[PDB]
Design a protein around this motif. Structure first.
Motif, PDB file in Angstrom:
ATOM      1  N   UNK A  23       0.915  -1.231  -0.266  1.00 32.18           N
ATOM      2  CA  UNK A  23       0.091   0.145  -0.009  1.00 32.18           C
ATOM      3  C   UNK A  23       0.917   1.344   0.051  1.00 32.18           C
ATOM      4  N   UNK A  24       2.069   1.306   0.731  1.00 27.42           N
ATOM      5  CA  UNK A  24       2.913   2.162   0.922  1.00 27.42           C
ATOM      6  C   UNK A  24       3.587   2.524  -0.498  1.00 27.42           C
ATOM      7  N   UNK A  25       4.028   1.485  -0.968  1.00 22.76           N
ATOM      8  CA  UNK A  25       4.840   1.456  -2.438  1.00 22.76           C
ATOM      9  C   UNK A  25       3.906   1.960  -3.241  1.00 22.76           C
ATOM     10  N   UNK A  26       2.445   1.886  -3.386  1.00 24.59           N
ATOM     11  CA  UNK A  26       1.620   2.536  -3.914  1.00 24.59           C
ATOM     12  C   UNK A  26       1.701   3.836  -3.922  1.00 24.59           C
ATOM     13  N   UNK A  27       1.365   4.483  -2.670  1.00 22.40           N
ATOM     14  CA  UNK A  27       1.469   5.999  -2.685  1.00 22.40           C
ATOM     15  C   UNK A  27       3.016   6.468  -3.143  1.00 22.40           C
ATOM     16  N   UNK A  28       3.892   5.830  -2.671  1.00 24.77           N
ATOM     17  CA  UNK A  28       5.148   6.436  -3.098  1.00 24.77           C
ATOM     18  C   UNK A  28       5.439   6.508  -4.713  1.00 24.77           C
ATOM     19  N   UNK A  29       4.840   5.449  -5.232  1.00 20.10           N
ATOM     20  CA  UNK A  29       5.009   5.748  -7.045  1.00 20.10           C
ATOM     21  C   UNK A  29       4.006   6.504  -7.628  1.00 20.10           C
ATOM     22  N   UNK A  30       3.082   6.476  -6.747  1.00 17.17           N
ATOM     23  CA  UNK A  30       1.729   7.399  -7.317  1.00 17.17           C
ATOM     24  C   UNK A  30       2.226   8.931  -7.221  1.00 17.17           C
ATOM     25  N   UNK A  31       3.108   8.930  -6.232  1.00 16.97           N
ATOM     26  CA  UNK A  31       3.668  10.334  -6.105  1.00 16.97           C
ATOM     27  C   UNK A  31       4.849  10.726  -7.073  1.00 16.97           C
ATOM     28  N   UNK A  32       5.484   9.728  -7.329  1.00 15.56           N
ATOM     29  CA  UNK A  32       6.491   9.757  -8.586  1.00 15.56           C
ATOM     30  C   UNK A  32       6.468  10.168  -9.701  1.00 15.56           C
ATOM     31  N   UNK A  33       5.128   9.443 -10.152  1.00 11.47           N
ATOM     32  CA  UNK A  33       4.331   9.922 -11.340  1.00 11.47           C
ATOM     33  C   UNK A  33       3.941  11.262 -11.429  1.00 11.47           C
ATOM     34  N   UNK A  34       2.921  11.616 -10.566  1.00 11.48           N
ATOM     35  CA  UNK A  34       2.225  12.691 -10.276  1.00 11.48           C
ATOM     36  C   UNK A  34       3.181  14.019 -10.228  1.00 11.48           C
TER      37      UNK A  34
END
Ligand SMILES: O=P(O)(O)OC[C@H]1O[C@@H](O)[C@H](O)[C@@H](O)[C@@H]1O
Ligand SMILES: O=P(O)(O)OC[C@H]1O[C@@H](O)[C@H](O)[C@@H](O)[C@@H]1O
Ligand SMILES: [Ca+2]
Ligand SMILES: [Ca+2]
Lengths: 485, 485
Positions: free
Chosen positions: A94-105
């Protein structure tokens, strides 16, 4: 300025340290034009929070640091939250998701910093899952910021080091020590190396003794539960004091890169002598505060959460010896305690007295170079001059300098320096494993004695600068504490 | 205190210097408990005066220094006068009478000091008759205080020395130089020898250049007649400046006795290089003031008694070289002139910049030790430190000290120091023959050029710190005057 492209993940993102020091520090880097478009801040903790709810927590942290609200709102758009149990491998997805979501955004190519503002027992676990659960960036850098304390003994320190070493390399591990992040402390190298008259004099042929002082006027106040087991020894001496001593005792580096800086410091640490029961009694002094002259200043044993039979040290003072050609026989005195005469963090280099016979009654005395770090930065230099008398005679005069108001609120607070330096990959103002292991070996030998109670526990009145033994300690080598209060 | 038993004879006892500086200085030694019962002051000059009339002259001199009139009246009872032509051998018998009358009245066993506040042409004559006409004490000491100037060229200096040598020994000859009698100047030795960090650094391996500055804001004012022929070169450079340079250039003495002090100074003087026509043009600069930005600040050529075609120097600046291992290649810059930016007498030791590469934009600059003598004593030390910036960078900070009010009016004025020191037989703060001969040889080589006009005469606006050539002079060796105004 040159934009800093990075992604920071805050473990324990709802804690008091995060609200009071971490977010404001990050906000300043935004205000100073360092953080611009390419950056994201992912908060994480055990509590449940909406991205809406977290943003308000951050909005509150920086309230006192906010001038233009539109500036604050723009900064806040880079924040996201995720509830998370750090002991659950499945939850890391779940944390990896938020981190990669941020990296893209925000379009960030790696460059991840993982800050751990969590209880010391979660350090190893977290580090392990960042690697195994795939949270480490495949590009850019990956750095871990470990909060205080790094162990409670050499053994526990080594364990932590081993766990962390399983997921990171030593140069990616940034151990926090806010004292090392203080502007004035960073002046030590500039004063020494920057001025040949001091550089060529930073040795046994010129110095009589060196003094380090971390004086506090406050008592245990509220952190008595944790403090009673740590004492001044592990709370101020092991960490802050030893690291300041490192900047002072270090050899002359081959360059000012953090690699050489540490090599120079470690050279001194590797020469530090470890004491046995007898030496501890002779070279070190431990004590705890009683009542002062004021009834309001109650003794340590009357503080909330403190056990009535406590033999804990609220004050420590002692002599350090470095078996290096450079410091052969030169005493390094250190002291730190609560309920003392004044809040002060300073260094005092006491030079040897000259032997030039002037024929006078009062011959040349020892010169002193003082570097005041807290509360306000200042530099003083006591030199020998002529007395305003008829017959030729000498006396000591004090030349001084103090930071201007222009300098003061323009100076970066420790947490900003540390975060900023980690983003830049500069470990110059951070302690390394070799330094931390030695400090622990040094303190352990002392603690063993205290734990076994094979050394006396002195006492001192709340408001003094410590027990009288502290003075006797220096008098033996013919020295005296420069700062009297 | 220990009573000073002495008998002082003042030649030119009616002159302005005697009234304004000599008597008040003597009065202070009485006020300070040094002069008590056994002492007498015999005034002498060409004018006729009753013992009653002379006492009133003295009563006037000390009016502004008088607190308790009864104290003043008691001091005045030690004064006697005698009219006298110094060129008349027979007239000395009258003077010997007054001196012996005084010796009996106050019970003084010898210990005679002869002060000559007369025109320089009477120096030799007076000295001769003190011996031949039997005025020298048969017991105690006999000392002669020669006023400024001691010659106007090496030749005339040597003649004077020869005449004086006929009646006294060199160690009995006290040549007056009020600058050497200044409290702050006497601090130079204490700062250097009293502090090892400076003592071991007072050489070519640490110093880049040394600066001596005797800046004056006043113009010729009224002494233009005598000044037009002397200029800044003989008025301030030859005497005051060279002697201050002597305290700075001297070697480390074998003791602080005046004998060793002078041996150490002379060692440097004997190494001072004497210039020829070419070197003078390259190393020295002479100039005279024009109008400033104010019409009130008129040019030198418009001053009363100044000839309209005058090529006299109201300003001098130049580089001194000492052929000694200790100062090999180190430039000693000196400057003195009228109508400058501010009244100031200071010394500036410019240390070499460090070579420790910090990786910064602004690398370590040169440290400076400044000793301000006039108008108010102060000590400053410019050191390298860290700038309050994010990226590591160095900057220069100024540590300072200033004499307190307690120190100020408690400090002895030059004339009191000189008279007092002569009474004590301490020649430490006095120039000797070797020093005076060298200073004259140094200045003569320069004057010869100027007299022949084989060097340019620069100009500068009244209010600046000198002509631009003064700056270019230092720029050539990569230096700059510390004091800017
Ligand atoms: O001078 P500063 O930064 O307030 O440091 C003092 C504090 O330093 C911290 O490291 C200690 O845990 C506190 O107990 C102590 O009061
Ligand atoms: O600083 P002070 O003691 O006033 O010294 C300056 C004076 O020194 C004297 O020696 C000069 O004859 C004067 O012309 C000059 O003004
Ligand atoms: Ca010892
Ligand atoms: Ca040159």
């Amino acid at each position: 300025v040159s934009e800093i492209k990075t992604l920071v993940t805050f473990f324990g993102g709802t804690g008091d340290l995060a609200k009071r020091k971490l977010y404001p520090s990050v906000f300043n880097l935004y205000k100073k034009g360092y953080l611009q478009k390419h950056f994201a801040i992912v908060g994480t903790a055990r509590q449940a929070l909406n991205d809406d709810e977290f943003k308000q927590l951050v909005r509150d942290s920086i309230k006192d640091f906010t001038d233009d609200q539109a500036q604050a709102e723009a900064f806040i758009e880079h924040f996201s939250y995720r509830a998370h149990d750090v002991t659950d491998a499945a939850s890391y997805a779940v944390l990896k998701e938020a981190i990669e979501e941020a990296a893209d955004k925000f379009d960030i190519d790696g460059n991840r910093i993982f800050y751990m503002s969590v209880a010391p027992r979660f350090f190893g676990t977290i580090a392990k899952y960042l690697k195994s659960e795939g949270l480490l960036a495949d590009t850019g850098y990956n750095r871990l910021m470990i909060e205080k304390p790094f162990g409670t003994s050499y053994d526990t320190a080594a364990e932590l080091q081993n766990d962390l070493e399983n997921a990171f390399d030593d140069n990616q591990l940034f151990r926090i020590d806010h004292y090392l992040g203080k502007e004035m402390v960073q002046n030590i190298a500039a004063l020494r190396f920057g001025n040949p008259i001091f550089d060529a004099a930073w040795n046994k042929d010129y110095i009589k003794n060196v003094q380090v002082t971390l004086s506090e006027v406050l008592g245990v106040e509220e952190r008595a539960g944790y403090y009673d087991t740590a004492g001044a020894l592990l709370d101020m001496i092991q960490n802050h004091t030893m690291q300041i001593v490192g900047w002072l005792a270090m050899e002359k580096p081959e360059s000012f890169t953090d690699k050489d800086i540490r090599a120079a410091k470690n050279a001194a640490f590797n020469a530090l002598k470890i004491y046995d029961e007898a030496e501890v009694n002779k070279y070190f002094v431990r004590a705890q505060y009683g009542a002062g002259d004021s009834a309001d200043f109650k003794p340590y044993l009357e503080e909330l959460d403190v056990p009535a039979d406590s033999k804990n040290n609220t004050f420590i003072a002692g002599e350090l010896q470095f078996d290096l050609p450079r410091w052969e026989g030169v005493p390094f005195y250190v002291r730190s305690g609560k309920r003392l005469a004044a809040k002060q963090t300073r260094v005092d280099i006491v030079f040897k007295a000259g032997t030039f016979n002037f024929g006078s009654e009062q011959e040349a005395c020892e010169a002193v170079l003082s570097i005041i770090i807290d509360p306000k930065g200042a530099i003083e230099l006591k030199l020998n001059a002529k007395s305003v008398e008829d017959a030729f005679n000498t006396r000591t005069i004090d030349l001084g300098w103090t930071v201007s108001d222009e300098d003061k609120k323009n100076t970066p607070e420790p947490y900003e320096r540390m975060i900023h330096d980690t983003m830049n990959g500069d470990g110059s103002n951070f302690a390394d494993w070799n330094g931390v292991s030695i400090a622990w070996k040094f303190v352990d030998a002392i603690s063993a004695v205290y734990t076994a109670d094979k050394a006396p526990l002195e006492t001192y009145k709340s408001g003094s600068m410590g027990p009288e033994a502290s003075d006797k300690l220096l008098a033996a080598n013919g020295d005296a504490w420069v700062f009297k209060g």
